[PDB]
Design an enzyme around this catalytic site. Sequence first.
Site, mmCIF file in Angstrom:
data_model
loop_
_atom_site.group_PDB
_atom_site.id
_atom_site.type_symbol
_atom_site.label_atom_id
_atom_site.label_comp_id
_atom_site.label_asym_id
_atom_site.label_seq_id
_atom_site.Cartn_x
_atom_site.Cartn_y
_atom_site.Cartn_z
ATOM 1 N N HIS A 62 25.988 40.664 55.116
ATOM 2 C CA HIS A 62 26.860 41.552 54.309
ATOM 3 C C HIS A 62 26.818 41.155 52.810
ATOM 4 O O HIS A 62 26.343 41.946 51.992
ATOM 5 C CB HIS A 62 28.326 41.569 54.809
ATOM 6 C CG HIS A 62 28.471 41.554 56.306
ATOM 7 N ND1 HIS A 62 29.232 40.613 56.970
ATOM 8 C CD2 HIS A 62 27.925 42.339 57.269
ATOM 9 C CE1 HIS A 62 29.147 40.817 58.275
ATOM 10 N NE2 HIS A 62 28.361 41.858 58.481
ATOM 11 N N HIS A 92 33.073 38.178 45.369
ATOM 12 C CA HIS A 92 31.749 38.546 45.876
ATOM 13 C C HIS A 92 31.282 39.758 45.088
ATOM 14 O O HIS A 92 32.043 40.359 44.325
ATOM 15 C CB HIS A 92 31.828 38.921 47.353
ATOM 16 C CG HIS A 92 32.846 39.983 47.643
ATOM 17 N ND1 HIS A 92 34.183 39.734 47.844
ATOM 18 C CD2 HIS A 92 32.710 41.330 47.734
ATOM 19 C CE1 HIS A 92 34.800 40.909 48.041
ATOM 20 N NE2 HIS A 92 33.948 41.913 47.985
ATOM 21 N N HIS A 94 28.609 43.419 45.204
ATOM 22 C CA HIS A 94 28.036 44.502 46.003
ATOM 23 C C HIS A 94 26.925 44.937 45.028
ATOM 24 O O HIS A 94 27.173 45.038 43.815
ATOM 25 C CB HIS A 94 29.053 45.637 46.230
ATOM 26 C CG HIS A 94 30.236 45.242 47.074
ATOM 27 N ND1 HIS A 94 30.342 45.483 48.424
ATOM 28 C CD2 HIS A 94 31.403 44.648 46.722
ATOM 29 C CE1 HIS A 94 31.552 45.045 48.838
ATOM 30 N NE2 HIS A 94 32.258 44.521 47.847
ATOM 31 N N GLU A 104 30.437 50.172 44.094
ATOM 32 C CA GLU A 104 31.130 50.915 45.131
ATOM 33 C C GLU A 104 31.919 52.024 44.424
ATOM 34 O O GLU A 104 31.878 53.178 44.826
ATOM 35 C CB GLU A 104 32.033 49.982 45.942
ATOM 36 C CG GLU A 104 31.236 48.907 46.662
ATOM 37 C CD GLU A 104 31.919 48.403 47.915
ATOM 38 O OE1 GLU A 104 33.028 47.852 47.802
ATOM 39 O OE2 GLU A 104 31.339 48.561 49.012
ATOM 40 N N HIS A 117 33.985 41.767 42.919
ATOM 41 C CA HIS A 117 35.293 41.918 43.512
ATOM 42 C C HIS A 117 35.986 40.555 43.521
ATOM 43 O O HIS A 117 35.490 39.600 44.133
ATOM 44 C CB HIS A 117 35.168 42.441 44.952
ATOM 45 C CG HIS A 117 34.706 43.865 45.058
ATOM 46 N ND1 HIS A 117 34.357 44.427 46.279
ATOM 47 C CD2 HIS A 117 34.680 44.826 44.096
ATOM 48 C CE1 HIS A 117 34.144 45.706 46.025
ATOM 49 N NE2 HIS A 117 34.326 45.996 44.719
ATOM 50 N N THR A 196 36.763 47.701 51.400
ATOM 51 C CA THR A 196 35.612 48.595 51.483
ATOM 52 C C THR A 196 34.597 48.225 52.589
ATOM 53 O O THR A 196 33.480 48.757 52.614
ATOM 54 C CB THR A 196 34.908 48.677 50.149
ATOM 55 O OG1 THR A 196 34.357 47.391 49.840
ATOM 56 C CG2 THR A 196 35.889 49.116 49.055
HETATM 57 N N1 LIG Z 1 34.751 44.634 49.164
HETATM 58 S S1 LIG Z 1 36.385 44.213 49.258
HETATM 59 O O1 LIG Z 1 36.961 43.620 48.056
HETATM 60 O O2 LIG Z 1 37.270 45.291 49.739
HETATM 61 C C1 LIG Z 1 36.727 42.941 50.476
HETATM 62 C C2 LIG Z 1 37.438 41.770 50.197
HETATM 63 C C3 LIG Z 1 37.667 40.810 51.196
HETATM 64 C C4 LIG Z 1 37.186 40.987 52.496
HETATM 65 C C5 LIG Z 1 37.411 39.935 53.586
HETATM 66 O O3 LIG Z 1 38.046 38.913 53.239
HETATM 67 N N2 LIG Z 1 36.928 40.038 54.949
HETATM 68 C C6 LIG Z 1 37.646 39.267 55.957
HETATM 69 C C7 LIG Z 1 38.700 39.834 56.700
HETATM 70 C C8 LIG Z 1 39.517 40.876 56.089
HETATM 71 C C9 LIG Z 1 40.613 41.454 56.860
HETATM 72 F F1 LIG Z 1 41.395 42.427 56.313
HETATM 73 C C10 LIG Z 1 40.869 40.983 58.213
HETATM 74 C C11 LIG Z 1 40.030 39.935 58.812
HETATM 75 C C12 LIG Z 1 38.955 39.363 58.064
HETATM 76 F F2 LIG Z 1 38.283 38.500 58.581
HETATM 77 C C13 LIG Z 1 36.476 42.165 52.791
HETATM 78 C C14 LIG Z 1 36.238 43.146 51.817
HETATM 79 ZN ZN LIG Z 2 34.059 43.689 47.926
#
Ligand SMILES: NS(=O)(=O)c1ccc(C(=O)NCc2cc(F)ccc2F)cc1
Ligand SMILES: [Zn+2]
Length: 258
Positions: A62, A92, A94, A104, A117, A196
């Site tokens: 990812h 991170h 994208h 995004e 992000h 996202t």
């Molecule tokens: N692109 S973005 O900024 O929106 C984004 C930021 C953080 C995460 C994340 O921490 N994943 C883990 C995670 C998130 C949860 F909401 C629940 C479990 C889990 F493992 C995912 C997307």
């Molecule tokens: Zn993100």
Amino acid sequence: HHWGYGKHNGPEHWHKDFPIAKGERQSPVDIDTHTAKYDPSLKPLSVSYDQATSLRILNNGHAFNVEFDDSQDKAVLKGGPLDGTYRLIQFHFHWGSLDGQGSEHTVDKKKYAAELHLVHWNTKYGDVGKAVQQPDGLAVLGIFLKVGSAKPGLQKVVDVLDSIKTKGKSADFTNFDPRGLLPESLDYWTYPGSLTTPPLLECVTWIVLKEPISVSSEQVLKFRKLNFNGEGEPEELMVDNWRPAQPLKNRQIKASFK
Ligand SMILES: NS(=O)(=O)c1ccc(C(=O)NCc2cc(F)ccc2F)cc1
Ligand SMILES: [Zn+2]
Ligand SMILES: [Hg+2]
């Protein structure tokens, strides 16, 4: 199987396992400059990153995350459309396979080469796990990257990538200063949204900065040499790890500037 950005398990398939994908406040969205409401009451942002403690960098399939110690208020976000303190936990990017795509969020349908992000969680909730069950649990500071001159502060992140090439790798990444990734101005657009990537939880207040940061071609090129796959599996280059814009629905995008 487990989601991805591939033809067979991509964004268009996400809804089968994550029904919230067709939700009311999904992200990302397109920022239409001529329709965003200038809300003069929006306060200025307060970014306090001088006591920031970066700990590790990892490739999780990812994307790649630089993690921060959030056991105390070391790096916080306050002000703007936010109420309460939000701790920085990780950041991170994208990005795309080409410079004309990667972000995004779009500004008037325009895609940037990448998007940073900076993820923060609402301190009143105690831990990130609780935060994701609340409508105002997260705050993500979005910053666009356009290709041009090299960003000095980004160089530290670029040089360590060779060591986290595949899924599951990590490497100590201490003493990194996130202040080196901010643009000059803090003007922003804000709207209520969601994560996202799956689980796609609608628990985010989005703050998108108007001014993008510029990075060199060689800098973003090194991002593109990472792998989605773990060691020993067929090579799949890490690119186009972005979700396309979603419908705004019954939502208002507020601008903090005129
Ligand atoms: N692109 S973005 O900024 O929106 C984004 C930021 C953080 C995460 C994340 O921490 N994943 C883990 C995670 C998130 C949860 F909401 C629940 C479990 C889990 F493992 C995912 C997307
Ligand atoms: Zn993100
Ligand atoms: Hg939530």
